[PDB]
Amino acid sequence: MKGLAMLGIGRIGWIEKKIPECGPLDALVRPLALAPCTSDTHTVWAGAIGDRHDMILGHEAVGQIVKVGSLVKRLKVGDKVIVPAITPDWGEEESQRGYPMHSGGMLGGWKFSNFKDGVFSEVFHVNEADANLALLPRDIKPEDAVMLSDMVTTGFHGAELANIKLGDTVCVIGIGPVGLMSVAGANHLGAGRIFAVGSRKHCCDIALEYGATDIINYKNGDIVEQILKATDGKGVDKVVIAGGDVHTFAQAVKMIKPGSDIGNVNYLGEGDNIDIPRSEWGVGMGHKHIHGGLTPGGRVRMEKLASLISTGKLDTSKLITHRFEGLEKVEDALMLMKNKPADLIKPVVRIHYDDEDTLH
Amino acid sequence: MKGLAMLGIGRIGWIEKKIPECGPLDALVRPLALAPCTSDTHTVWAGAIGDRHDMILGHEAVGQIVKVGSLVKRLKVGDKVIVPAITPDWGEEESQRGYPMHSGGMLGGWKFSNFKDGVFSEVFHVNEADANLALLPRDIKPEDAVMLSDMVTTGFHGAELANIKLGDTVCVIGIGPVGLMSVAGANHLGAGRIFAVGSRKHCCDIALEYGATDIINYKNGDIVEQILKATDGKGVDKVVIAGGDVHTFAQAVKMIKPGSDIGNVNYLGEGDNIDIPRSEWGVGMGHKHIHGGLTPGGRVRMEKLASLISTGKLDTSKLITHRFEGLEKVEDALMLMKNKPADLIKPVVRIHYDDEDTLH
Amino acid sequence: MKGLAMLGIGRIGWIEKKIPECGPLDALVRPLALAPCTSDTHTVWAGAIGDRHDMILGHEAVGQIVKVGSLVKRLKVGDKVIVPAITPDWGEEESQRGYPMHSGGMLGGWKFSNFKDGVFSEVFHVNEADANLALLPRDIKPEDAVMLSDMVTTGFHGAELANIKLGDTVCVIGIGPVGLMSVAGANHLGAGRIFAVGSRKHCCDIALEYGATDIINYKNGDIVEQILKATDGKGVDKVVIAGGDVHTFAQAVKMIKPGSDIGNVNYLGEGDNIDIPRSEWGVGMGHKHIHGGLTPGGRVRMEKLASLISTGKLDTSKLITHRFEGLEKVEDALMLMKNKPADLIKPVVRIHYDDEDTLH
Amino acid sequence: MKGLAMLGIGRIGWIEKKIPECGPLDALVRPLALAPCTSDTHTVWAGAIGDRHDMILGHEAVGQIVKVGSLVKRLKVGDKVIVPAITPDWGEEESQRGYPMHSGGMLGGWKFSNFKDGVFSEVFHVNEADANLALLPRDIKPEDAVMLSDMVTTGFHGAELANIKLGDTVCVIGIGPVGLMSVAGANHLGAGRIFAVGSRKHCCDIALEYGATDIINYKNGDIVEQILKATDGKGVDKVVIAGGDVHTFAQAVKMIKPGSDIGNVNYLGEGDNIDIPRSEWGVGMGHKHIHGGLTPGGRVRMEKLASLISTGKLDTSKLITHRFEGLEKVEDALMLMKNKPADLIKPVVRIHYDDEDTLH
Ligand SMILES: C[As](C)(=O)[O-]
Ligand SMILES: C[As](C)(=O)[O-]
Ligand SMILES: C[As](C)(=O)[O-]
Ligand SMILES: C[As](C)(=O)[O-]
Ligand SMILES: [Mg+2]
Ligand SMILES: [Mg+2]
Ligand SMILES: [Mg+2]
Numbered sequence A, B, C, D: 001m002k003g004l005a006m007l008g009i010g011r012i013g014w015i016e017k018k019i020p021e022c023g024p025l026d027a028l029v030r031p032l033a034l035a036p037c038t039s040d041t042h043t044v045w046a047g048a049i050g051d052r053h054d055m056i057l058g059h060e061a062v063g064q065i066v067k068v069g070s071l072v073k074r075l076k077v078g079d080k081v082i083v084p085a086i087t088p089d090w091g092e093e094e095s096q097r098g099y100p101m102h103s104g105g106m107l108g109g110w111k112f113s114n115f116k117d118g119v120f121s122e123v124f125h126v127n128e129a130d131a132n133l134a135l136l137p138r139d140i141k142p143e144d145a146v147m148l149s150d151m152v153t154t155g156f157h158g159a160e161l162a163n164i165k166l167g168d169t170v171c172v173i174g175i176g177p178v179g180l181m182s183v184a185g186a187n188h189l190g191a192g193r194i195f196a197v198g199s200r201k202h203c204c205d206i207a208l209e210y211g212a213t214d215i216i217n218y219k220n221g222d223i224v225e226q227i228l229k230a231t232d233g234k235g236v237d238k239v240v241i242a243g244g245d246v247h248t249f250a251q252a253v254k255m256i257k258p259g260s261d262i263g264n265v266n267y268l269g270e271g272d273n274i275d276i277p278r279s280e281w282g283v284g285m286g287h288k289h290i291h292g293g294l295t296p297g298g299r300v301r302m303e304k305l306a307s308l309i310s311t312g313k314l315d316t317s318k319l320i321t322h323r324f325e326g327l328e329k330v331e332d333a334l335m336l337m338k339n340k341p342a343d344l345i346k347p348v349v350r351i352h353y354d355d356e357d358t359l360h
């Protein structure tokens, strides 16, 4: 089979690999819709999680089952599935301790395009498939559902980590697709006033459609002073960090009230240290809790989030700015995320099969 | 002054009372907008919380300050305020351990029309005024803000007690005004599918506008069976009880998954015992958590919820089905709550003063 | 092989069964140390969870691995293990949402002697062995470690469900071996004063050694009145239920403060309904939270609790009042749990093998 | 009256001040037992929380009521009280939001020797006295209880912030008196293995008496490598930071597992930034939660912690290494904390009065 792979830090290329073996609990899956992620750009070109050889890239897919292991009981060949970016080993220590996304070690539930061949190939492998794949609801388009795999779950996790409460004033820093889903998540956790902070302008407007009330432009003054002015010096109740760099945490601490939460979901691609300012952190004692976490995954997470689409309560289509057909175009799509043109949010790649609707 | 009072179990009438005394931390307030509550109905006619004589009724008000104590620092004469139904003693033991609504004993933060003269009088008393009174935002109509005092905060509290998570399937039992607010609260905590259980048709359309997806009418049969059918036997994730009686808890237990929460905010007006069925409660071990709580109050709770009106994220006007003018009309309004026409959600009474815009 | 089985309601006896089949993730285990439980007593003689025929009893074992499946990676033949009473299916829905003890449905992680052949046989089966079996630390006697399987973990779980905070005054109702472990768990969650409710005198001294401060015997009168007197009417902060019957919950409600938690871990053997008194439950609004939960299990739970024995912080040996040798003596041991001499806390049965120290 | 005051950053001296006025909710209190704190050394000589003029120092006291305001209902003249270092304004926004220690702003519940005249004077003032003073139990020595005001509550808060669970392996970094109470707190929250990390050796031994199992000497190698070696590379479950500097956080992150908590209570006296290492923080995603908080205070906190002394479950006497008599000796005692001799943990100063036992 063909797949698009990382060939050591700094290089991608198409390669041929055998089809993965399918153990008793596993499933093999062919992609129907795929998206590329900014995370793969940090991983390939910044070496942000270390070196990899012949690793198929990608971790956002809707797919169709082409094989199941002997002990798979909930899935059959031909089933269409939402594939979560995180596919935990559910019996590992960290899963039993409430952190399945770190199953087998830090970030270990994130397999696809972390250390496991991902979804940018003709067939890919899923561990604990009964546990890790949700059936695609008949009322959701494959491209809408591909946004669940990572963008919705990660953005929403930012808002979960920020411990957002009913009527909270929230600031979301970074308004790419994960940030837009952090705004939506905060809205769905009951935030009132929501400040969206972008480098851009263009897609801070879409943030208003997901529940943002106030847009803050970096290219204007210091965002902290802008935020303190808008709040009459009081600051915000909670902060989600969904973009930026290692220096964004200091801004969050400076704009937030004492007794609060900062929820980071940004994959930090470079920099030795994240600096937290001693004074504005209440000299160690301000209860400004700092969290940084990898998204949940598995079937239940996808099922719960999918219900928001099915019930008309979340529109993920707004994130899709560019559409391609054919497995080859995942290369083109990943290069867009590397080069970041103006009107880009997320590309999606659809793949057609002649037995798409008849495979069994 | 005049006020409408409970004159022992089964009787109300107007009485004259002295204007209450104002201590250093207290405020005296006059009503600008008032609403009656079915709670006063249980208290008066069912004797649900014991006998009372000459206790002024009502605990839902937007008001205007007429006097402040010498130690009140945030408020002044003429300020217009949202009065929470619950006005805790914030330094009491129960407050220090995170339950201010029980300040000084069980239900002790619910003063107005529980054991303290309520808001249905020309002047009423607020303890710890700086802590307990939120300023009325200029962008909210008094009639909409009076829904914050109890309806919004109580219905939202049901959703909070039910521990609603993103994408959960929720059942709200009872769709009076509290119930509609439990649907809204559930929606604002991120619920997907939401079953609303009631019989009235307009309640069962406003509920859809607040985020209900599914309407369950008992006339179509046993509501548990209905819910189990609709969820292909798995049941719902979380339940909010916002109406019904002591037997509603068994229904909740029977329709909910193991590892779940039942959030009750219904004031139970009669019956010796709430029956929990042993087998369906997992013979003691089902992790079907049962919560029954009085609403939060105080200014912060009002400020936070008011922000949802100010930001366009909550429309409390849908709750108002009857409008009156003049203080004396709180009697007619309360009688609506007792006689219960199918026209009814919430009445509001508007009261004007010659110096409503000039008092200072 | 032979095993001691429930032969329908009201009868036990020895039977021959095939050695169970071992799948890729499973392990077969032989008992080194066994204990009987009053739970099997309710199951057999009261029919508390329905009828069963030819189901092998017991769910408390230290064991030795005799076979592993092809996909078992952490265990090998001859390894000695602590077997949790609860052995979840970790990838099931309920596990993914944080309730692995209900994997596959309510009580579904409690397999042994609920619906799956238990540990009272020459060989028994463990699903998801790598996840579910902890290695026996070399510094713990098998007889002490067998208390971890259910007694420690269940009693500690009562304390966890009761939401015990530093310095809380706690009442533990029922001071059998689970109850003594609820006292210990409460002590290990930082409780100060701890009332232990029972009638037996030695239970009411071991309880003092585990952190009880106050012993309450019903023979001195109504236990609620006793507790209210002892707390000058304010009542207790938190209650753990570890014994009694369906009527114990009302006692708990009556003796506890508003804004509190009642943590039940008692397996209720009979009765249609658990009665919660309306007035004392704050007419629905007292924030007296009611929790009823099956113990956690799996290896991590066993590892964590075992660490408390290894570090000198928990002495489970005090629980053991009767010691037997040989597998057949699990019958005598279970009959002790049924006939209930005042001598009794927990029996343990030790089973030896010629190759106990050489099997590999 | 005389008091020991901060006279601008860098200077202390004895000054004369009038006795404070006593408002309706206030109490005036004379000291019976006092302790100095390392925090006052950062505040005076490092200027760590800004400049102050004529501010009486100290915030650890047991005292006796000499005057009460007209609305004080729970205290009378002559009552002996445990005075918490934190005396919140319980109705302020932050208190209503669950953070009373930040009442009126970050650190605002910490009044004594933060910005309010403290306890090192013949008479001092307490706001909201009914809420903020606990009666001294008859079974606790004044000097034992002085350790509750700050040392026990802060150390225990470190363990609370570290989210310690039953059987957790914990590392406590910094083993001064706050650290020794963090070890005790972790023990009282159910930790198993506990590593105590000191610069010293002498009072790492006392740490074993409070539940530490392993001592780690800074003067030996890198504490992170020591800890990873002792845990077979697995690291610890939770970390409490109770001493050190801005660089201690990086050590905590490097020794802790993914999916975990670091609870800081160290008042950080200098340094612009606290550095968190990007890589070992899981490049933003390791769920290594970082918390830093000021202790709770008020009466209930003191009452709960005092119960641990009364019940024989906490011995605070072990912290007292030096004893003085007379109000003047608080100067001597504070200089010990500045200069830090070898065998010092905490000094205590007792003050005798001829009507100590007769004042009314
Ligand atoms: C699976 As990810 C770290 O790109 O959100
Ligand atoms: C203050 As109420 C019990 O009527 O919601
Ligand atoms: C596994 As059990 C209900 O006997 O503690
Ligand atoms: C009151 As303190 C910051 O010295 O623990
Ligand atoms: Mg707000
Ligand atoms: Mg005028
Ligand atoms: Mg451990």
Ligand SMILES: [Mg+2]
Binding pocket: C360
């Ligand atoms: Mg051999």
Ligand SMILES: [Zn+2]
Binding pocket: A008, A009, A051, A052, A053
């Ligand atoms: Zn390489």
Ligand SMILES: [Zn+2]
Binding pocket: A037, A038, A039, A040, A059, A085, A150
């Ligand atoms: Zn991604």
Ligand SMILES: [Zn+2]
Binding pocket: B007, B008, B009, B051, B052, B053
């Ligand atoms: Zn009467």
Ligand SMILES: [Zn+2]
Binding pocket: B037, B038, B039, B040, B059, B085, B150
């Ligand atoms: Zn009401």
Ligand SMILES: [Zn+2]
Binding pocket: C007, C008, C009, C051, C052, C053
């Ligand atoms: Zn039968």
Ligand SMILES: [Zn+2]
Binding pocket: C037, C038, C039, C040, C059, C085, C150
């Ligand atoms: Zn058992």
Ligand SMILES: [Zn+2]
Binding pocket: D008, D009, D051, D052, D053
């Ligand atoms: Zn100065």
Ligand SMILES: [Zn+2]
Binding pocket: D037, D038, D039, D040, D059, D085, D150
């Ligand atoms: Zn201090």
